[PDB]
Write a protein that holds these residues in place. Structure first.
Motif, short mmCIF file in Angstrom:
data_model
loop_
_atom_site.label_atom_id
_atom_site.label_comp_id
_atom_site.label_asym_id
_atom_site.label_seq_id
_atom_site.Cartn_x
_atom_site.Cartn_y
_atom_site.Cartn_z
N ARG A 1 14.89 39.64 -0.28
CA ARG A 1 14.53 38.46 -1.06
C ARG A 1 14.07 38.95 -2.39
O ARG A 1 13.61 40.04 -2.48
CB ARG A 1 13.44 37.67 -0.37
N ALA A 2 14.14 38.12 -3.42
CA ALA A 2 13.89 38.63 -4.75
C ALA A 2 12.93 37.72 -5.50
O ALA A 2 12.98 36.52 -5.34
CB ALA A 2 15.20 38.79 -5.48
N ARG A 3 12.00 38.33 -6.23
CA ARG A 3 11.15 37.64 -7.19
C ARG A 3 11.25 38.42 -8.47
O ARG A 3 11.08 39.62 -8.46
CB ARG A 3 9.69 37.64 -6.76
N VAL A 4 11.47 37.74 -9.56
CA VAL A 4 11.49 38.37 -10.88
C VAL A 4 10.41 37.71 -11.74
O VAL A 4 10.23 36.51 -11.62
CB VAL A 4 12.90 38.18 -11.46
N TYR A 5 9.74 38.48 -12.60
CA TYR A 5 8.69 37.97 -13.52
C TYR A 5 9.13 38.22 -14.96
O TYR A 5 9.36 39.36 -15.33
CB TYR A 5 7.34 38.70 -13.32
N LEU A 6 9.17 37.17 -15.78
CA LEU A 6 9.70 37.28 -17.15
C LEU A 6 8.68 36.85 -18.21
O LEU A 6 7.92 35.92 -17.97
CB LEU A 6 10.93 36.37 -17.29
N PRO A 7 8.67 37.51 -19.39
CA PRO A 7 7.89 36.93 -20.50
C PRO A 7 8.56 35.67 -21.07
O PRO A 7 9.79 35.59 -21.07
CB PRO A 7 7.84 38.07 -21.53
N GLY A 8 7.75 34.72 -21.54
CA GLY A 8 8.23 33.48 -22.17
C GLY A 8 9.30 33.66 -23.24
O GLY A 8 10.23 32.85 -23.33
N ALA A 9 9.18 34.73 -24.03
CA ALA A 9 10.14 35.02 -25.10
C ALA A 9 11.52 35.58 -24.64
O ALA A 9 12.42 35.76 -25.47
CB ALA A 9 9.50 35.96 -26.12
N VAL B 1 11.73 32.88 -9.60
CA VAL B 1 11.49 33.36 -10.96
C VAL B 1 10.16 32.83 -11.50
O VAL B 1 9.91 31.61 -11.43
CB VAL B 1 12.61 32.89 -11.92
N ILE B 2 9.35 33.72 -12.07
CA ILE B 2 8.06 33.35 -12.66
C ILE B 2 8.01 33.78 -14.12
O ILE B 2 8.28 34.93 -14.42
CB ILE B 2 6.88 34.02 -11.91
N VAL B 3 7.60 32.85 -14.99
CA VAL B 3 7.66 33.02 -16.44
C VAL B 3 6.25 32.87 -17.00
O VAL B 3 5.61 31.83 -16.80
CB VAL B 3 8.57 31.95 -17.10
N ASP B 4 5.77 33.90 -17.70
CA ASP B 4 4.41 33.91 -18.21
C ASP B 4 4.50 33.58 -19.70
O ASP B 4 4.95 34.42 -20.49
CB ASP B 4 3.74 35.27 -17.94
N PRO B 5 4.13 32.34 -20.09
CA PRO B 5 4.17 31.97 -21.52
C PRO B 5 3.34 32.89 -22.41
O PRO B 5 3.77 33.20 -23.53
CB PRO B 5 3.57 30.55 -21.52
N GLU B 6 2.18 33.32 -21.92
CA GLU B 6 1.26 34.17 -22.69
C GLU B 6 1.66 35.65 -22.77
O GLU B 6 1.25 36.34 -23.71
CB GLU B 6 -0.18 34.05 -22.16
N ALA B 7 2.44 36.15 -21.81
CA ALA B 7 2.84 37.57 -21.80
C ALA B 7 3.80 37.88 -22.97
O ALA B 7 4.95 37.46 -22.93
CB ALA B 7 3.50 37.93 -20.47
N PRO B 8 3.33 38.61 -24.00
CA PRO B 8 4.20 38.77 -25.16
C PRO B 8 5.39 39.74 -24.95
O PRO B 8 6.35 39.67 -25.72
CB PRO B 8 3.25 39.29 -26.23
N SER B 9 5.31 40.60 -23.94
CA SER B 9 6.28 41.69 -23.70
C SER B 9 6.34 41.99 -22.21
O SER B 9 5.38 41.73 -21.49
CB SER B 9 5.82 42.97 -24.39
N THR B 10 7.43 42.62 -21.77
CA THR B 10 7.60 42.87 -20.32
C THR B 10 6.57 43.86 -19.75
O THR B 10 5.96 43.57 -18.74
CB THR B 10 9.06 43.16 -19.84
N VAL B 11 6.33 44.98 -20.44
CA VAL B 11 5.28 45.92 -19.98
C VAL B 11 3.91 45.24 -19.74
O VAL B 11 3.23 45.57 -18.79
CB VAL B 11 5.07 47.14 -20.91
N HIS B 12 3.55 44.28 -20.60
CA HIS B 12 2.30 43.50 -20.42
C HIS B 12 2.23 42.67 -19.13
O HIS B 12 1.14 42.33 -18.69
CB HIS B 12 2.01 42.61 -21.64
N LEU B 13 3.38 42.33 -18.53
CA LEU B 13 3.40 41.64 -17.24
C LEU B 13 3.05 42.56 -16.07
O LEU B 13 2.74 42.06 -15.00
CB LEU B 13 4.79 41.05 -16.94
#
Ligand SMILES: CC(=O)OC[C@H](/N=C/c1c(COP(=O)(O)O)cnc(C)c1O)C(=O)O
Length: 382
Positions: A169-177, A193-205
């Motif tokens: 099963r798969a979960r992916v986490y993406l920055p808003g941009a 899929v989970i999208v973090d509006p505040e996360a400016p970059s992928t490493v920050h997630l």
């Protein structure tokens, strides 16, 4: 004597560290490898052979075998391009195309374009780590388990399709941009899929993905740190440059690329610089303030490009400059590259302009298709 390497691939679940790569460099530089009396007493050596793309291993008392005997140069692809399954199509339908561009750079710098959108799942380079990581994972983690990671976009699509071909099963986490294909395609492929509006970059997630992993018990496959990502590109993306250069007649003098986790250009540079240390790796530093989707500045933290013993140059490139280069490759060759590909074309075109590069053939690694980047196309025309 030659024997099959598949049988001895428990060394993938036992060798740790990078000391084993010393074996790779010598085998590649010499163009041969010593026969092992006891294959099991030499885990470092066996792993090195697999990592450079051997299909066989040299066994017996005192002999040696060449790279061609070992299967580094084996042709995998069916002439007819018929495959019994998609996963086998990823595996055997290789190399991805190396296309000589009509783009002319100064000082006799000849541009060749390695088109990594010719990967079946993500139409991007990120397929190769995603099959390697998940393939090893199938050994250990029970089917039905959730596997997960952060992504700019490509790996999350690759992870989602491949996870689901392997029962996971798969979960992916993406920055808003990130682009809409990243946020949408995994869901088409059955991931959450989970999208973090505040996360400016992928490493920050990353902290978020680690926290949730601790709470939830999913396997965080961790592309930034997971050594399979570098090893995929050693036996695949890099090895292919090695083989194609020789078979193509190329006077290979360098590679050009872009850095996210640093997996593919670390592998290209190391593999190639084992064979011939002069080969330049021209890498891209996205310019300060700007965002080029898929890639980042080195000092935001990269594993292999730092720690492995790799000679590389950086060239600064703005988004606007990466998009200029998309436009001109599309007018020269009629091939439509992604923003990160144009960033590596540009970055090579600068060192070429500067006079920092020898005359000859350079291979640029183009990570994906421009068809997934309509906004940055539209903006770059106006
Ligand atoms: C920023 C980042 O770490 O992205 C990693 C990964 N992207 C790889 C990538 C890269 C960089 O490749 P690697 O350095 O990750 O091997 C370049 N261009 C595009 C379009 C890419 O998708 C992803 O899709 O998550």
């Amino acid at each position: 004597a030659l024997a099959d390497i598949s049988g001895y691939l428990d060394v993938l679940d036992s060798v740790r560290g990078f000391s084993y790569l010393e074996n790779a460099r010598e085998v590649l530089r010499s163009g041969e490898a010593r026969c092992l009396g006891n294959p099991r007493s030499e885990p470092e050596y066996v792993k090195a052979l697999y990592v450079i793309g051997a299909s066989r291993i040299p066994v017996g008392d005192g002999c040696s075998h060449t790279l061609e005997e070992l299967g580094v140069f084996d042709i995998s692809v069916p002439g007819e391009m018929v495959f019994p399954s998609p996963l086998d199509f990823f595996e055997r339908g290789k190399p991805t195309p190396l296309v000589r561009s009509r783009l002319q750079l100064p000082n006799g710098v000849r541009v060749w374009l390695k088109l990594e959108w010719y990967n079946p799942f993500s139409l991007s380079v990120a397929d190769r780590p995603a099959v390697e990581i998940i393939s090893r994972l199938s050994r250990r983690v029970e089917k039905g388990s959730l596997v997960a990671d952060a992504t700019s976009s490509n790996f999350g699509v690759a992870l989602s399709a491949v996870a689901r071909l392997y029962g996971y099963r798969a979960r992916v986490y993406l920055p808003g941009a990130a682009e809409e294909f990243g946020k949408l395609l995994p869901r088409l492929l059955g991931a959450q899929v989970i999208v973090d509006p505040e996360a400016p970059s992928t490493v920050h997630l990353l902290p978020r993905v680690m926290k949730d992993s601790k709470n939830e018990g999913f396997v965080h496959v961790n592309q930034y740190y997971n050594d399979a990502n570098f090893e995929a590109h050693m036996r695949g993306t890099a090895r292919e440059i090695f083989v194609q250069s020789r078979r193509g007649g190329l006077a290979l003098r360098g590679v050009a690329g872009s850095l996210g986790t640093s997996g593919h250009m670390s592998a290209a540079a190391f593999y190639l610089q084992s064979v011939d240390p002069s080969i330049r790796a021209v890498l891209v530093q996205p310019a300060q303030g700007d965002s080029i989707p898929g890639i980042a500045r080195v000092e935001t933290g990269m594993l292999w490009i730092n720690m492995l013993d790799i000679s590389y140059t950086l060239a600064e490139v703005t988004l606007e400059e990466a998009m200029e280069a998309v436009v001109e490759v599309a007018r020269s060759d009629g091939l439509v590259i992604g923003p990160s590909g144009g960033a590596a074309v540009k970055a090579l075109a600068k060192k070429a302009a500067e006079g920092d590069l020898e005359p000859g053939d350079y291979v640029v690694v183009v990570p994906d298709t421009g068809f997934k980047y309509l906004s940055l196309v539209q903006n770059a025309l106006e």
